[PDB]
């Protein structure tokens, strides 16, 4: 038993809610919140901008030190950093950004990072301003992640479309 509330059960291990991941994190304080990162950990907009804003830019400061030490992530890769006031840890995961022309096949690799954590609060990778088909992203999630994932989808119309079209 865990403390996530109001989620719809899609599969054995995947749950979904129409909610802002920031507000879900502030409520649950999960062990892991997933950020929809880019390879430079530049958290300007989308989910990343929203999470970073809710940390008062502490996420960005920490990320800048990470990049200065380690260099950029790979598309499809991840790193674990602090969750600041939102969660114990933040798993920064880089899905492919179709609006940058990146290879959507890397989306499966991106979701594989979730399997290193028993439970996660996550956004829909590569959707939104990353330009991929959100129905496809949800399909890849369900077919790749084996650990327990609570998906927060902020856009109400999208949430409704995702539930109604789920196979
Ligand atoms: O709705 C969707 C589908 C894909 C990404 N996305 N956005 C979010 N998803 C979960 N929580 C928060 C946001 C969010 N909220 C405010 C500003 C920006 C944001 F990205
Ligand atoms: Br977005």
UniProtKB/Swiss-Prot annotation:
| Activity regulation | Inhibited in vitro by GRL-0617.
Catalytic activity as recorded in UniProt: Thiol-dependent hydrolysis of ester, thioester, amide, peptide and isopeptide bonds formed by the C-terminal Gly of ubiquitin (a 76-residue protein attached to proteins as an intracellular targeting signal)
Report the domain of life of the source organism: Viruses
Membrane topology per the entry is: Multi-pass membrane protein
What is its subcellular localisation?
Host endoplasmic reticulum membrane
UniProt domain Macro: residue ranges: 1-167
Quaternary structure (record): May form homohexamers. Interacts with N protein.
The record describes the protein's role as: Responsible for the cleavages located at the N-terminus of the replicase polyprotein. Participates together with nsp4 in the assembly of virally-induced cytoplasmic double-membrane vesicles necessary for viral replication. Antagonizes innate immune induction of type I interferon by blocking the phosphorylation, dimerization and subsequent nuclear translocation of host IRF3. Also prevents host NF-kappa-B signaling. In addition, PL-PRO possesses a deubiquitinating/deISGylating activity and processes both 'Lys-48'- and 'Lys-63'-linked polyubiquitin chains from cellular substrates.
**This protein's name:** Papain-like protease nsp3
Q: What does UniProt list as this organism's lineage?
A: Viruses, Riboviria, Orthornavirae, Pisuviricota, Pisoniviricetes
């Amino acid at each position: 038993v865990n403390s996530f509330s109001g989620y719809l059960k899609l599969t054995d291990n995947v749950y979904i809610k129409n909610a802002d991941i920031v507000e879900e994190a502030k409520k649950v304080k999960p062990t892991v919140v997933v950020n929809a990162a880019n390879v430079y950990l530049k958290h300007g907009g989308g989910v990343a901008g929203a999470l970073n804003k809710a940390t008062n830019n502490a996420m960005q400061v920490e990320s800048d030190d990470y990049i200065a030490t380690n260099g950029p992530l790979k598309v499809g890769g991840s790193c674990v950093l602090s969750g600041h006031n939102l969660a114990k840890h933040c798993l920064h995961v880089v899905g492919p950004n179709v609006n940058k022309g990146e290879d959507i096949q890397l989306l499966k690799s991106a979701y594989e990072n979730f399997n290193q954590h028993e439970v996660l609060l996550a956004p829909l990778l590569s959707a939104g301003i990353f330009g991929a088909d959100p129905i496809h992203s949800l399909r890849v999630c369900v077919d790749t992640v084996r650990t327990n994932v609570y998906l927060a989808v902020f856009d109400k119309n999208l949430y409704d479309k995702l539930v109604s079209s789920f196979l």
